[PDB]
Design an enzyme around this catalytic site. Sequence first.
Site: not given
Lengths: 525, 73, 514, 544
Positions: D58, D91-92, D395
């Site tokens: 993540d 998010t990455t 996620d």
Amino acid sequence: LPQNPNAGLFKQGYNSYSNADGQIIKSIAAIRELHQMCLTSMGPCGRNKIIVNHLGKIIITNDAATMLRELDIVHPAVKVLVMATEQQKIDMGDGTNLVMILAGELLNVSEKLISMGLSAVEIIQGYNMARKFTLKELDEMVVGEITDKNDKNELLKMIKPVISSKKYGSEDILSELVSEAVSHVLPYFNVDSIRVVKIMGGSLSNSTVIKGMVFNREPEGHVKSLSEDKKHKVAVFTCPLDIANTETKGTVLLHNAQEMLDFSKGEEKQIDAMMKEIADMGVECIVAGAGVGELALHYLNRYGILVLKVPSKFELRRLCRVCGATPLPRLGAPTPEELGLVETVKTMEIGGDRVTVFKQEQGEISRTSTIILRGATQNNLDDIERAIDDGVAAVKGLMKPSGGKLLPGAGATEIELISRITKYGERTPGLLQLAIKQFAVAFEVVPRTLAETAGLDVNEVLPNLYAAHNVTEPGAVKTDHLYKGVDIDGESDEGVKDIREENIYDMLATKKFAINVATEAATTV
Amino acid sequence: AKTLVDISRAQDAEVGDGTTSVTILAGELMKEAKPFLEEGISSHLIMKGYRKAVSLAVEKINELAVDITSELL
Amino acid sequence: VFMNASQERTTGRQAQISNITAAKAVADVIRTCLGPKAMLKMLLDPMGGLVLTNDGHAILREIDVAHPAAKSMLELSRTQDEEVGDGTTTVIILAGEILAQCAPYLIEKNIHPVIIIQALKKALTDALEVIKQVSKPVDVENDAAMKKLIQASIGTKYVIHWSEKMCELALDAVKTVRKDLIDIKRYVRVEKIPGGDVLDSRVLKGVLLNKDVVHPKMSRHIENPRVVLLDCPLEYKKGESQTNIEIEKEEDWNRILQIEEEQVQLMCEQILAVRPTLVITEKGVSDLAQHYLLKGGCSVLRRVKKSDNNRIARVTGATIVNRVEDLKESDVGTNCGLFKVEMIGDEYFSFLDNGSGKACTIMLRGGSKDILNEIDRNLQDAMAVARNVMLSPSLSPGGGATEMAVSVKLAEKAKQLEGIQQWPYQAVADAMECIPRTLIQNAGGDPIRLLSQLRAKHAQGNFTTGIDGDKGKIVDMVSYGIWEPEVIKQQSVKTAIESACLLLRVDDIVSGVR
Amino acid sequence: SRSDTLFLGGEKISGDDIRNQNVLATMAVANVVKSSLGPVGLDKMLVDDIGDFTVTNDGATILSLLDVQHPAGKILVELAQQQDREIGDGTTSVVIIASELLKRANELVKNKIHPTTIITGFRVALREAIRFINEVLSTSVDTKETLINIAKTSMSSKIIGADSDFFSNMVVDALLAVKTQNSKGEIKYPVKAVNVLKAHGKSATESLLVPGYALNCTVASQAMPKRIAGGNVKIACLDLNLQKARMAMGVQINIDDPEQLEQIRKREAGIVLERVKKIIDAGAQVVLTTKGIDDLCLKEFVEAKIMGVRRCKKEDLRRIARATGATLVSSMSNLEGEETFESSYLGLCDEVVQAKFSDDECILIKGTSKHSSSSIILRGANDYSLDEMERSLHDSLSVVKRTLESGNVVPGGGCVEAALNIYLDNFATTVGSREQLAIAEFAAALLIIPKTLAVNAAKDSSELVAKLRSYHAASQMAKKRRSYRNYGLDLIRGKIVDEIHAGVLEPTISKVKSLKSALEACVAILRIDTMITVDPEPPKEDPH
Ligand SMILES: Nc1ncnc2c1ncn2[C@@H]1O[C@@H](COP(=O)(O)OP(=O)(O)O)[C@@H](O)[C@H]1O
Ligand SMILES: Nc1ncnc2c1ncn2[C@@H]1O[C@@H](COP(=O)(O)OP(=O)(O)O)[C@H](O)[C@H]1O
Ligand code: BEF
Ligand code: BEF
């Protein structure tokens, strides 16, 4: 409260023991460390890694025997495979990477065999019996017509691969200068004579090769030196040009006026006397090798005689072998059977540096020649002389019969060997079978190592080569500059035979030492 | 090393006998699976390649099956 | 366990990018100095360096960079001043800008240096051709061809305001040696006098020097004199080897005394028998040595700097003769038209005016001890651009012009040669605009409008059109007196790129300890 | 020099140095997690400088563990944790886009462009970029079949990628099947999700989903039943804290003349049990409090064979009672006067069995009146993995929710980020002049992602991306279809392939909220030219 395990058997200060199996797992990895660093270095399409001396100097190379030359290692095991590459670069110019590459791999693959169940003694005999078969098999795997040495024809064909290996992209132009400086030595021949002189300025492509060595120095005698002649006859000698100084205790004593009033003159006399004597001999140039006297220098400038300052004792020789003259202690007593003719002794300047030369010969033609390398980086110009010394060593082997036997390099041979070595172990009963089938796949280095360099999917390059045992020569290899797998025969790319044999031996020798040791007792400080 | 020493008790609770073995297998499982990492294309092709392994292997591990009476235990 | 503790290693993209982006540092500093709106820098090394020379070498020497991929620039520059005088600054610009534009591919890749390396390796030698196509010796050939090639060089230096003087200054001295059709670039002599000004710099058409004295009664000046280049000590210098004079008898001492006196007494007279007006030697005579020669009306000379006296014979045609007792009459130098001792600053120079003489000594005056030197180095970059303007009457239409022209060439070839070799071809192509970029950014006139309008035109013609901020806008630098010697623009690219690949030939970097 | 103010500890950087320090500080936090994204991407391990590790792929959680030194870097960390709120995934990636926007933006003002011009060059390119999303996402409203695809695309570039197809459904089904609520006339899936645990040891694939909640608790007294199944069970979520009872504070107790200290001692306990029984008398098959039951009040819930759980998770008894139709009771009194309890307070489930999972046991609650209960109990080798397996869950569950809460979805896999690349530059460059060079970089900055999806594979991938270009540019230009565009990257196997033809698919929302915020961050830093940083409060260190 406790506790604490005592010490089983004591000793002096501190010492380090190493259980043999554990050490092998542990030291086989240390070895493996310098492997991944030497992999990317070998071959043309590879890479070069910078190194900063313990003195601060900066060094960049492709050669793996130099990488370690500038590297301060600690691992007694790694020390070995480093001693290998180094103990080869001296005896044989090129092939220093195939040393480490194999050595490392041999150890790498031997692991599997050591873990399977084999023993070090069993592993040794296994590999050994392969070194005798791999050395002989190659003695016939050649098929590369042992070309006879003449002109630049055969030279440029061999001297290129020796160069295109690290200084890739300048293969053509580079080796050209090499072979050039070579053919100025009338064929037993000495490798050492071809010296190299690099001077900053312009691009490398503007380098040149002159028949005779270059001196980064100005002609003595101040503005009284000619610095420009035509086909002058030279005479070189060591003994100091100045007055005959007492090698032992010696001074100058005067008793009466007549003595003093004349002692000052006496010197002047002898001086001119010594000089004119050597000048009448037709001597157009005096190359001083040791000591220069201003007292008597008065004479030499006036007639119109050059004077080359005193080089190094070792540089006078290689110089003399250009002129044709011969050195001679003591001043005076010149011998025409010891005089030498020099074509031109002018004073040209490159990069804005005052320099004298011996370029070109009508003429007697020098026995030693030097390459003038113009460049833009101190570092590169240095790792060019290396790619040169490698070449100068390749012409050193071809000059000693019958090493002038070619061989399918470019991985070609290093790939065919895979199978040829397999068969031997495929048909040899005993536990030694495994120890052989390993020594075989050990040669997977050169193949893969080339592919992985160019971004080529290694999973395709290997299979392709295996299919291409063609046996046409082979006849089968890999050029990073094409598609799929290339053909050695075409590119005119072939690695000299004897170099490979030396590499294949020194590795199998070193790899055996590392395998052989069981316990390592290292000291401290 | 801290992940391995964890599988030890990670296993002991579940069955409680495969203490010594699980570590000895987990470890050696990578040693003979390492040279296929660099020489292999990626670390993820090996992942999928391991599923087809544990699946098939668990099967073969079921072939050699014996029945407990429930004295004879 | 190896490796030894401790020595840093950067394996991976690290050194691959932290060497280009690290070389960019020094290449980001100098990238402001170049062209008409120049930005000269000042720097204080250890001790009071207090040196302000715009010579890109002179600058990159003081930074004393320690980084490998940086000391490459302090090297790719150092070379320049060996081959071509000026341009030292502009090399690094590209040398780095290349490295710079190599980052985009190298990062979104997945592309090995070897690829990029040879990729530029071609573009380079490709550009080298276009240059060799433009120089033309010599359409309107005149002795002014060199003169205006220097006004392209001195321009935008600490002399530009007063340059038209330092222009004819340089040319003159250059054309005093037989290098036409070979002769060193040392013989012209650059002297440093304390007070004064740039404008008050004298171009001695002969020699220049000062020396220690022991008696001033000598004649201060002599017209068309006879100059002997002696090179001896006459006071009474002890014999080389251990010289001793053991004696016997009462009345012998004086004999030895009057003998010693006699020995030197003679030598002195010997000089007289040459009929000189000024004895110039490289060693020391003080005391009676001066006294007598002064009575005869000859300004004695303390040993004259080594490289000094070696100028005097050539100018005067004389030949230095370390021997006094065999002094021939055809070894003296009379070429001196007028030799005086006109005092300047806090010092006193002996100038040998007048010519048929090689060393055109320049006694450069200054207003600040840190500026006299900034002018010196501001002519070393000129005298050489003159020397090369002679050696090769081939002239490159500089002023960011030869660059904008080469670009179109490289950009032309790259399109036909599409592929993973198109980008790296359009690299040195684009990066070739490095010069015209800040060349204008320094000035102020908009660069982006200027090149977006310079390309848009130079592309459809205007092969030798650079950016001339004299009137704003841009025009053919070929018309104006904008001339840069061939060797500069050519050799520089081959060099700037030589390192622009070396630093890509780098895998990792391993250090040491102290 | 200066004088300016104020030193020491208080300094400021100016113009160039800052605009650089800002970009470096951004590429820093960026380039670390630039390997993560893409199926070809890997995970990492962060060390608690005390040995303790944590493996994770993540990007959000990974950047949090970094520490985020500096304003520019932490600004990205802040932008990261924003994405989870919008979406939950990407998010990455969002960090990358932003970083690239600055990287390029500054590389323009380094070309003397001036920020104002650039800050608009994005301001516009952004709006038009979404205007192109109007053509891509729309066709992805119609295409349970494509929901397991989105939940699967949220597996790749992750640990659970190897068992994607398997967990792809475990994800979908709990939310789709048993996780729906309704507040103020609005239908949505739990943005607070559905309880998920971890089972130490056991098989990877064998992670047991549950037809009910999985309250992680142990039976109060051992004397209680370990299970009560069958059908129609009496559940009671009582936050009454029915343990004991002590005098109401401020209500002191002074006795006399008695001899009555005992007459109420037990009376203190009586009133407790009196309430305990009053509740047990309505059902009492299973009792679930939050405060907890007491030993002297368990014996009573024990003898009746009523499973009682001492001090449960308050956030659970809610979700549980909401499904069993029960009513999480707060105080005993219901209006006045009331004891009280009504069988109308109890719940409706099928089984309340306390299961076992390797040296541990949790009570499950299978079946409910309202069929909305799901709990996925993972199981793997180590905590080190079983936790990260959950990260891929939290996620991935999200990617679905966001999807099922917005009909529009988008062909991910570098597809969208490729179309924009070609579409704006080819078609946005109407303004031209200088503003063009800005828009340009805004589009070029988008390739940053497709690039790294490839570079993640050791093999030369410079070409695989070049193809994605020509292909996508094909939709319009240059020099009735069939539309030859809409393809995408197949990281697994080299060469382009239609993404919609594949399980790959990312929610449009994600491709927006991330494209938008990535800009604001960039802009906010563009406007920066000077960072005054004043020192904190030093220790007294007084010489006196
Ligand atoms: N066209 C080529 N010309 C020269 N060498 C090539 C060529 N193609 C591949 N090679 C590689 O270059 C040689 C080895 O590289 P080198 O750095 O010299 O290792 P070593 O000097 O230790 O033998 C070949 O045997 C081969 O593997
Ligand atoms: N008239 C001019 N207008 C604009 N630029 C000029 C003009 N003359 C010279 N230049 C620029 O200045 C010169 C480059 O010199 P540079 O390497 O930058 O520093 P230096 O002149 O000190 O060596 C070139 O001739 C050109 O790029
Ligand atoms: F690698 Be070899 F020694 F050139
Ligand atoms: F400064 Be210039 F380039 F010599």
